[PDB]
Amino acid sequence: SHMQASLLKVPYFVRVQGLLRICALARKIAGGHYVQMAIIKLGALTGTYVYNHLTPLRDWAHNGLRDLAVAVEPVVFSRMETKLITWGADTAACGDIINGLPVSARRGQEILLGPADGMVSKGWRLL
């Protein structure tokens, strides 16, 4: 799904499993909390976030990890802004760009990202 922005063509659920399995290894070592933070941040780069209500830190986290985190929904180690959006097939418009692609047309509750050229003849309407 284009809405997940993952560098890896792998299901989100499975990506979190793999990431936490690497973390589990450091759960009991000395600077283990530092290690996990590193791996979690590396996961973020790949476009994979972990949430406490889905994969409780209590089941894999080193005791010091939670102190390094400034948030666990999802787990992040530096300030990250919080925004509100209402975007939907009903409000989408030209000018909008989603994960790198420009909004170009609509057809029902579907929105076309990228070039729309030659799509009008098929029921798509330009936004």
Ligand X SMILES: CCCCCCCCO[C@@H]1O[C@H](CO)[C@@H](O)[C@H](O)[C@H]1O
Interface contacts to its own copies, rule CB under 8 A: 1-6, 12-13, 47-49, 51, 53-54, 70-74, 76, 80-90, 94-99, 101-102, 104-105, 109-117, 119, 126
Is 73 considered catalytic here? Answer: yes
- Other CB atoms within a 10 A radius of the CB of residue 7 amount to 9
Query: Which residue out of 33, 62, 81, 94 is catalytically annotated?
Result: 94
SS3 111: strand
Burial class (CB in 10 A: 0-12, 13-18, 19+), 63: exposed
Residue 122 CA to residue 55 CA, distance in Å, equals 44
The answer to the question of residue 106 lying near ligand X (CB under 6 A) is no
Is 81 considered catalytic here? Answer: no
For its own copies, the closer of residues 13 and 28 by Cβ is 13
Name 19's bridge partners: none
Q: Which does 27 bind (CB under 5 to 8 A by kind): ligand X, its own copies, none?
A: none
SS3 21: helix
Q: Which residues are catalytic?
A: 53, 73, 94
Binding site for ligand X (CB under 6 A): 8, 10, 14-15, 17-19, 21, 30-31, 34-35, 38, 41-46, 48, 78
